[PDB]
Each structure stands twice: as structure tokens, then as C-alpha cells.
Enzyme design. Structure first.
Site, mmCIF file in Angstrom:
data_model
loop_
_atom_site.group_PDB
_atom_site.id
_atom_site.type_symbol
_atom_site.label_atom_id
_atom_site.label_comp_id
_atom_site.label_asym_id
_atom_site.label_seq_id
_atom_site.Cartn_x
_atom_site.Cartn_y
_atom_site.Cartn_z
ATOM 1 N N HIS A 122 42.501 26.590 38.087
ATOM 2 C CA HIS A 122 42.181 25.977 36.810
ATOM 3 C C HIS A 122 43.187 24.860 36.483
ATOM 4 O O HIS A 122 44.346 24.891 36.913
ATOM 5 C CB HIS A 122 42.198 27.093 35.763
ATOM 6 C CG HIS A 122 41.707 26.704 34.407
ATOM 7 N ND1 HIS A 122 42.449 25.931 33.538
ATOM 8 C CD2 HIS A 122 40.588 27.062 33.733
ATOM 9 C CE1 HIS A 122 41.789 25.802 32.400
ATOM 10 N NE2 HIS A 122 40.662 26.485 32.491
ATOM 11 N N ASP A 199 48.232 33.436 37.349
ATOM 12 C CA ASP A 199 47.315 33.085 36.268
ATOM 13 C C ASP A 199 46.266 34.191 36.193
ATOM 14 O O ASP A 199 45.369 34.263 37.033
ATOM 15 C CB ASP A 199 46.698 31.713 36.528
ATOM 16 C CG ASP A 199 45.611 31.355 35.522
ATOM 17 O OD1 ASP A 199 45.337 32.175 34.601
ATOM 18 O OD2 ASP A 199 45.026 30.249 35.652
ATOM 19 N N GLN A 202 41.404 35.436 33.956
ATOM 20 C CA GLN A 202 40.101 35.991 34.320
ATOM 21 C C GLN A 202 40.193 37.387 34.906
ATOM 22 O O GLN A 202 39.185 37.888 35.418
ATOM 23 C CB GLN A 202 39.369 35.102 35.340
ATOM 24 C CG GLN A 202 38.752 33.842 34.805
ATOM 25 C CD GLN A 202 37.850 34.078 33.594
ATOM 26 O OE1 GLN A 202 37.111 35.072 33.514
ATOM 27 N NE2 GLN A 202 37.916 33.156 32.641
ATOM 28 N N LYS A 225 39.692 35.478 25.770
ATOM 29 C CA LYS A 225 38.853 35.952 26.861
ATOM 30 C C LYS A 225 38.872 37.460 26.982
ATOM 31 O O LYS A 225 38.018 38.034 27.675
ATOM 32 C CB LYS A 225 39.300 35.333 28.182
ATOM 33 C CG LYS A 225 38.847 33.911 28.325
ATOM 34 C CD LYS A 225 39.792 33.167 29.203
ATOM 35 C CE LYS A 225 39.232 31.816 29.495
ATOM 36 N NZ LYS A 225 40.267 31.039 30.202
ATOM 37 N N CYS A 363 36.930 22.902 34.303
ATOM 38 C CA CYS A 363 38.362 22.683 34.335
ATOM 39 C C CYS A 363 38.927 22.983 35.719
ATOM 40 O O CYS A 363 40.055 23.472 35.879
ATOM 41 C CB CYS A 363 39.126 23.522 33.303
ATOM 42 S SG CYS A 363 38.743 23.107 31.641
HETATM 43 C C1 PLP Z 1 40.183 29.691 30.664
HETATM 44 C C2 PLP Z 1 41.292 29.934 31.663
HETATM 45 C C3 PLP Z 1 42.506 29.267 31.516
HETATM 46 C C4 PLP Z 1 42.878 28.565 30.224
HETATM 47 O O1 PLP Z 1 43.211 29.474 29.190
HETATM 48 P P1 PLP Z 1 43.388 28.998 27.665
HETATM 49 O O2 PLP Z 1 43.062 30.165 26.766
HETATM 50 O O3 PLP Z 1 42.424 27.859 27.410
HETATM 51 O O4 PLP Z 1 44.799 28.502 27.388
HETATM 52 C C5 PLP Z 1 43.412 29.235 32.568
HETATM 53 N N1 PLP Z 1 43.131 29.852 33.762
HETATM 54 C C6 PLP Z 1 41.936 30.506 33.925
HETATM 55 C C7 PLP Z 1 41.676 31.174 35.244
HETATM 56 C C8 PLP Z 1 41.005 30.549 32.884
HETATM 57 O O5 PLP Z 1 39.805 31.208 33.042
#
Ligand code: PLP
Ligand code: PLP
Lengths: 405, 405
Positions: A122, A199, A202, A225, A363
Site C-alpha cells: 500500500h 503493515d 488488513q 477497518k 493505493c
Molecule cells: C487501508 C490500509 C492502509 C491505510 O490505512 P489508513 O487507515 O488509511 O491510515 C495501509 N495499509 C493497508 C494494507 C491498508 O489496507
């Protein structure tokens, strides 16, 4: 066992009508709907307990401070950190990655060093590292993709060397649904004395997550999320790393003393990374979202979602000229394109049927470029989605194909 | 005309009981209670309209994007900016000051330059400048205070020179209630080609604010002190300055293109300063808070609050050994100490009576040091406070004095 009908009854938006038809919300990977337990925990705080939260003297403020530190403890147990003081409240995954890139990156990545990301990242886990590399004169290296949407792990020996300072890697891809082999990659990274930022935006809503078993040095995710409110996220940092990191934002509450002639000194970790009034409302709601998910059980969620995904992949076989992207064991999301039609058009027709999917580059432009398309469609299958909503998506893709083909 | 009883009926926390007694919340300068119009606008968004907001294709997301850009327009009208695109959404005043200090400060303040702050500044408007000065090797200069809590304006000729790049100044002190002569100081600052950042966190809720008439280059304030939700604030930047500023945080939504071989390019102002998912819930609630305040009328609010303040100052004359800090024309807050008792004890007794005041250094240690005390008590008199609550405070200080004297 899981009961999707009892779960859906907690989510007021799922009754909504879009364009005159019943909503099928298949875009949870972009942001999840919220249960009323979460909506009402935030509202009830504002209605009965609201105050400023910096160990103020009066009752409301002292109680608000305790609610916030309890959410920190609960979040730390949720990801199995050793200590609550290893968690920093941030606006979201993006801000958490930027905080690491600045506070830890600026004092640990020097000219001539390299950082490793993957090609499926991302933008939140790309741009802060590009900026860091430009600030200090280091090199950004990239783990490439296989056609099935997994990492080419055979390239790691050419990318890790003694100057590799950081691996920044996604736990679960927001487009492909690929889950990466974090534990092994972290073992490899630590053999070179590199740190690993994961990260996890998800991952935390699909199965249990255990940062002690992963042994990652940083872990980030977003409240919104995880069925929680916007404006709040979690950054986990190993205690030994965190108590060495300098502050990023400056201001109230992160200082120990402020002097205009003798300079300023900082307070201890977590709190040295939290300047100004926190997002107390978001923190309360995040706590309720964690309680809600834990009450359902992430293993029950994972089982229902995996079954829903296998059903959807089975049904989509009957859509002519459907291209799918990613591995067969995908979690959460299905990225696809329909024949030669542009994703934007497919998504517009699906919206006209009351089906919310996402279109565009998600993104993840380097990922789009690897596959030589400008955009994809993406359907999210969350814990509150149903077989009937999968059927509406399949039928819709079939109708769109007949009409536009 | 203003009716405090009709106003108080909108604020559910004002019914609360603290320690068995009715709450007298006199701590709005630290954070304001919220009307149900604000609490319900946020809740209703989560219940019926929630979605991700990056001009997504489907209906909910397109409508959520429009709600957010409407709040940006409404906020810009509220402070009379020329354009909505001069407003950046931030977590609060603190983050907004840090964004300016990094994006604009790092590329406009060089070794040998100086920045000017005042001695009454909140830590949010000190620490980011101390950090900037340490990064680039510039000097932080300080406008000193008079005993009555006003700025010594006669020192300005010795502090402004041709190397002065920035004046960062509070509109209204969060401790003293002093309002500074912004318009004149800005005229002086611009004669040397210095920019002015104004910290307006304590101004926007007490009277109308007009950034075109002030001619400030940056203006910041926080939602949660403006009767709005936590986690949201506004940074105003003059369009010509803002379209020259580089990004601060990086990630999704602030890019135009992302490439792992050709580098990354940025999108246009406001949006280039907003990385990741915004705090949509906070933004919706902030819009409702602005509608609510505008419906009452800031001039009606200002009149009721000024009358309440004059009543309180008149009554406090009958408290023995009360020391007050600041000018007689103070806005919003009364900073005091009671005899020789420590502020912490006075505040604890007042809390025991159900009266919430704040004690301590109020995130203004240089101000405390100027007055040679470690701490003060501070009572806020907001638009929902009453003469009877002033009477409870006066009576309480009298009882505390008898008991502890
Ligand atoms: C959506 C997401 C992000 C961004 O998170 P934010 O809440 O917009 O700061 C980063 N990495 C992954 C894998 C995502 O799904
Ligand atoms: C409270 C306040 C701040 C800090 O604002 P946050 O919402 O905590 O970021 C800064 N300046 C003044 C004058 C304040 O009253």
C-alpha cells in the site's frame, strides 16, 4: 459457531437502501461498517463522561484518563504485546508508519544504507520510506511479485546485505488478499540486524495476531477497518526500540519540562509520542470495537469468512471473461477485472445495482503496474456479508457482461 | 438575545452528578462539553451513511466525500478564509503547528535565522519551534510579559530584525485570558518579511474570527474546544504560501503518482497535506458544532460570556487572600491561587464539591515561571455556565480558606 444473521443485526447501515435497492456493502477493506455497540460507546462517553484526559484533578478527567489507559491495555492484549506501554495511539496505519519513518528512521538509516519493501505494498507503506530515503540518501529496494500474487522470495539474498536497516512488509495485501510469511522473513531480517515494520491494516480483523510470536519490531493497524471509529490507530513498538526513539510531534503532554532558557526535556515512552489532546472519543470507540470482535471470536470470524470466500470463488467461475488477481488462498478481498471493460464502468453498474465495490488503483499503483492494468475492481467479503450478496455480485457481473460485451 | 437555560438543555453531561453532587463544569478551556446536535450528527453518520471517502465510485462513498468537502467549505466561511482550499484537516492545534514547523519551517528557516514566540505560549506553540530551531540552527526569541499578563510590546524592536522568519503568537491565552493585538503585530511582522502563525485554540469559541482582516499567514484551532468531537482540528494557510509547501506525512490520497523506479509526485494543496483515511466521523461532528455555534451567534455568546465574567470577578472580590493572574478584560478563563495553599489542594476540595476546575501548569510552564509559582487554578466560564455555578465556586473558595487557613 457463528451466526451471520445475529451479527448483521448489530450493523444499522446494512438496512440502508442505495439507489432504491438494498445495499450490498462489499467494500470493508476500504473501511468497515460499525456495530451499534461501537457507535453507542462513543456517543455514551460524550453524553455522560466527557472531559479532558491528562490526569486532571477532577473526577470526570481522572475517569476519562483511566478509560483511555484501559483501552491501551486492551489493545496490547488483543495483539499479545508484552506491555501496554509498547502501544502508541496514532490517527491510523499511515500516521504510524510516518512516525516510525521519522523518529526511528532519521536516527538509524544513514547515507549508503538500504530499506526493503515489497511490490504489493500500500502507498502508506511506500511513500514514507521514499521520503526517508531522499532525506538521508539511502536506497529503497523492492521484493518483486510472482504472477499468482505472492512474493518472489528467491530474490531475498540479493536484496539483504549488511547495510539493510529495515524490512517494511505487508501482513496481508489490501488488493490481492495474499498473506505473507512474516515469521520466516523476520527471522531472515534479524540475521542481518535489520528491523521489520509490519503493515497489519488488513490482518487484525481476519484472524488472531500475535506480535510476540511474529517477533516484529513495529506493527501498525487502523481502527476504522477493525469495525471501529475513524481517526484512531495503533502503533506497536518493541519496548527496547521504543525507549530509544526521539519524539516526532512536540507539544503538550509529551514533555517533562519546558524552559525557554534551559531547553525542554521529554517524558517516557508511549506518552512521549502523543502530543496534544488525544482522540479520546476514537479511543473509547476503538475499545468497544475490540471487545465486540473478541466476543465473536476471531477464529469463528476466520472460519465464516473463509467459507464465504470459497463459496464466492466457486460461484465466480460462472462469470465469462473474469480475470482474478492473487492466490487461491486469498483472505478478505477479491481483485478482478471483467473482460476488456474498464473497472470504473463495472463498478458504476454494480453501484447501480446497489452493490458497493471499489475500483481504481487501490493505493497500490506499483501493484497495478506489475499486472499491466490501470485499475481493478475489488470486492471485500467481511464477517457480515452473506451468500446472497455474493449471488448478487455474480449475477451483476453476468448482466454487465451481456449488456456491454 | 441569549438564553443559557435553553442552551444548557442541549448539553447532556450538564445533568451529571459528581461525587453525589450536581456537576459544575468549569474546565471548558481544557475541553468543551458537546451538544447532542453534535453527538447525534456523528452517530447518525455512522448509523446510516458510513463509507470510505476518497471519491469512491459507489453512492455511500461519493456522498461521504461530499459531506467532508462541505465541512471544509463551512469551516472556511466560519473563519472568513478566501477559499475552502486554504484549510487543512489536522488532529488539532498541536498537529497543525507541527505541520507548519516541518513543511514550511524546514524549507524557510536556515542557520542564523530567528523565530519569535511569546512568554505566554501554550507548549503546543513552543516545543515544535524549539525542535525546528535545533534542526536548522536558528534562534528562538521571546516576547516577555508584563505583571498584568499582557505582552511587553516595547521589546519588539530588539527582537525583530532582517533575519526574523516567523512570529508565532497566541490569539488568546489559555491561562490568562489575555487577547493579543494580532492585527498590529502582524503588520509589524510583515514589514520585515516575516510570516505569522496564530494559535487560535482559545479564540474561535468566544468571538468571531476573520483571518482576512487579521492577515495572518497561518491560523490553527481544535474541534474539541469548539464544542465538537475530539481528534479534529483546522489549519488555515494563505493560498500562496500553501501551494509552495512540501508534504509532511506521506501515503495514500496525497500522491498524484507512485512509482518504485520513477519516484513519486504530489497532488495539489489542501489534499497533499492529508495522508491516509481522514477522521471522517470527527469532520462530520465538527461541521455540526460550527452550525450549532453559528445558530447561537458568536456575538450573543460573547455578550453572555462577558457578562458572566464581570459577575464572577465582582463576586471573587469577597474571597480572602485570592491572587488573580492576568488582565481585567480577560476572556474565558480566570487563573488564580488561594492564599498559600497549593493549587492541587484547592482543586481537590473544589472537585469534592462537584466543581471541576483545572490545576497545574496548564501546558504553560514558562508562564508559571514568570509568575514564580509552580501551578495555578483555572476556572473556565463558557456559554453554558451560570451565575449559580459562579456562586458555588466563590462559596467553595471561602470554605476552603476557612478550613485550611
Ligand atoms: C487501508 C490500509 C492502509 C491505510 O490505512 P489508513 O487507515 O488509511 O491510515 C495501509 N495499509 C493497508 C494494507 C491498508 O489496507
Ligand atoms: C489547548 C490548546 C492548545 C492545544 O490544542 P490541542 O487540541 O490539544 O492540540 C494549544 N494552544 C492553546 C492556546 C490551547 O488552549
Amino acid at each position: 459457531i457463528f451466526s451471520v444473521d445475529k451479527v448483521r443485526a448489530d450493523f444499522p447501515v446494512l438496512s440502508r437502501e442505495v439507489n432504491g435497492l438494498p445495499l450490498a456493502y462489499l467494500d470493508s477493506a476500504a473501511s468497515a461498517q460499525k456495530p451499534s455497540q461501537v457507535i453507542d460507546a462513543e456517543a455514551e462517553f460524550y453524553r455522560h463522561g466527557y472531559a479532558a484526559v491528562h490526569r486532571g484533578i477532577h473526577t470526570l478527567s481522572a475517569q476519562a484518563t483511566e478509560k483511555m489507559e484501559n483501552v491501551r491495555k486492551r489493545a496490547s492484549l488483543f495483539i499479545n504485546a508484552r506491555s501496554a506501554e509498547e502501544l502508541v495511539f496514532v490517527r491510523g496505519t499511515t500516521e504510524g508508519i510516518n512516525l516510525v519513518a521519522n523518529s526511528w528512521g532519521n536516527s538509524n538509516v544513514r547515507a549508503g544504507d538500504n530499506i526493503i519493501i515489497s511490490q504489493m505494498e500500500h502507498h502508506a507503506n511506500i511513500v514514507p520510506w521514499q521520503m526517508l530515503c531522499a532525506r538521508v540518501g539511502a536506497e529503497l529496494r523492492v521484493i518483486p511479485l510472482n504472477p499468482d500474487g505472492t512474493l518472489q522470495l528467491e530474490t531475498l539474498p540479493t536484496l539483504f546485505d549488511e547495510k539493510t536497516r529495515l524490512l517494511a512488509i505487508t501482513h496481508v495485501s489490501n488488493v490481492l488478499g495474499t498473506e505473507n510469511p512474516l515469521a520466516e522473513m523476520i527471522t531472515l531480517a534479524h540475521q542481518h540486524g535489520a528491523k521489520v515494520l509490519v503493515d497489519g491494516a488488513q490482518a487484525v480483523m481476519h484472524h488472531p495476531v500475535d506480535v510476540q510470536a511474529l517477533d516484529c519490531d513495529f506493527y501498525v493497524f487502523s481502527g476504522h477497518k477493525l469495525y471501529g471509529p475513524t481517526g484512531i490507530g495503533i502503533l506497536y513498538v518493541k519496548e527496547a526500540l521504543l525507549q530509544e526513539m526521539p519524539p516526532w510531534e512536540g507539544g503538550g503532554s509529551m514533555i517533562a519540562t519546558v524552559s525557554l532558557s534551559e531547553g525542554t526535556t521529554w517524558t517516557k515512552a508511549p506518552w512521549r509520542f502523543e502530543a496534544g489532546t488525544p482522540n479520546t472519543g476514537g479511543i473509547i470507540g476503538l475499545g468497544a470495537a475490540l471487545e465486540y470482535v473478541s466476543a465473536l471470536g476471531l477464529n469463528n470470524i476466520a472460519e465464516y469468512e473463509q467459507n464465504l470466500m470459497h463459496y464466492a470463488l466457486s460461484q465466480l467461475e460462472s462469470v465469462p471473461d473474469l480475470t482474478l488477481y492473487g492466490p487461491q488462498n486469498r483472505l478478505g478481498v477479491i481483485a478482478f477485472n471483467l473482460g476488456k471493460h474498464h473497472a470504473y464502468d463495472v463498478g458504476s453498474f454494480l453501484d447501480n445495482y446497489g452493490i458497493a465495490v471499489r475500483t481504481g488503483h487501490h493505493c497500490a499503483m506499483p501493484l497495478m503496474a506489475y499486472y499491466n492494468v490501470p485499475a481493478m475492481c475489488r470486492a471485500s467479503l467481511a464477517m457480515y456479508n452473506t451468500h446472497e450478496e455474493v449471488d448478487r455480485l455474480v449475477t451483476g457481473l453476468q448482466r454487465i457482461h451481456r449488456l456491454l460485451g
